[PDB]
Amino acid sequence: ADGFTVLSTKSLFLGQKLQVVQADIASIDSDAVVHPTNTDFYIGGEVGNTLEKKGGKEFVEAVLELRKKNGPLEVAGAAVSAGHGLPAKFVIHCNSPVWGADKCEELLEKTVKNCLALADDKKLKSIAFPSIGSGRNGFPKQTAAQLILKAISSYFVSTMSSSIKTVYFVLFDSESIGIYVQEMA
Numbered sequence: 001a002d003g004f005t006v007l008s009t010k011s012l013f014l015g016q017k018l019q020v021v022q023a024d025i026a027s028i029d030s031d032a033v034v035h036p037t038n039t040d041f042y043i044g045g046e047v048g049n050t051l052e053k054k055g056g057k058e059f060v061e062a063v064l065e066l067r068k069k070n071g072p073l074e075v076a077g078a079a080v081s082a083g084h085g086l087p088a089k090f091v092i093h094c095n096s097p098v099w100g101a102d103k104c105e106e107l108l109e110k111t112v113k114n115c116l117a118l119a120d121d122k123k124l125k126s127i128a129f130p131s132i133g134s135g136r137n138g139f140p141k142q143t144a145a146q147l148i149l150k151a152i153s154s155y156f157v158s159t160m161s162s163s164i165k166t167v168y169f170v171l172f173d174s175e176s177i178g179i180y181v182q183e184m185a
C-alpha cells in the first residue's frame with residue numbers, strides 16, 4: 001500500500017463492473033469499504049485492524065457511535081458508519097459468519113448481498129469487499145472467494161435500479177492472491 005493492481009474485471013448483468021484487485025482495503029477510495037465484524041462491532045479482525053491502523057481514533061469513534069445507535073448486529077446483518085479518517089466515504093460493517101457454524105456458506109452469501117443492499121440504500125456508486133470469513137473466521141480462502149463472487153453476481157441479476165456501478169473484490173494476503181490467479185483471471 002498504496003499498492004493497487006487490477007487482477008481482473010468482469011461485466012455484471014446490467015453492465016456493472018466487478019474488479020478483483022490486489023490492495024490494502026483501507027487504502028481503497030471507494031464509496032464504501034466492507035469491515036467483517038461480529039455482533040458487538042468488534043474491531044479486532046484482520047481487516048478491522050488494517051482500518052484501525054489507517055483511520056486511527058476517528059475510525060474507532062465512528063464504530064463506537066454506530067455500536068451505540070444500532071445495538072447488537074444480527075447474524076449476516078449489515079450496518080454503516082462514516083469512514084472518518086479513511087479514504088472511503090463509508091464503512092459497511094457485517095456480522096461475518098464463522099466457518100463451521102450452521103449454514104455458514106449461505107450466511108456468507110446473505111451477508112454479501114445485505115452489504116450491497118445497504119450500499120444501494122445509501123445511493124453509493126462503489127463498494128469494496130475483502131474476502132469476508134477467511135481471516136479470523138476460518139473459511140478456506142478459495143471457498144470464501146467463490147461464495148462472495150457468486151453472491152455479488154447474483155445480486156445484480158435482474159436488478160434494474162442499483163446505484164452501484166463498481167464492485168471491488170480486494171485480495172491482500174498471498175494465499176488468497178495466489179488461489180485467485182492460479183485458477184482464472
Ligand SMILES: Nc1ncnc2c1ncn2[C@@H]1O[C@H](COP(=O)(O)OP(=O)(O)OC[C@H]2O[C@H](O)[C@H](O)[C@@H]2O)[C@@H](O)[C@H]1O
Pocket residue numbers: 023024025026036037038042043044045046047048050096097130131132133134135136137138139141170171172173176
Ligand atoms: N489490509 C487488508 N486488506 C484486504 N484484505 C485483508 C487485509 N488484511 C487481511 N485481509 C484479508 O481479509 C480477509 C478477511 O479477514 P478478517 O478481517 O479477519 O475477517 P473474518 O474472517 O470475516 O473475521 C472477522 C472476525 O474478526 C471480527 O472482529 C469478528 O470478531 C470476527 O470473528 C482474509 O482473507 C484476510 O486474509
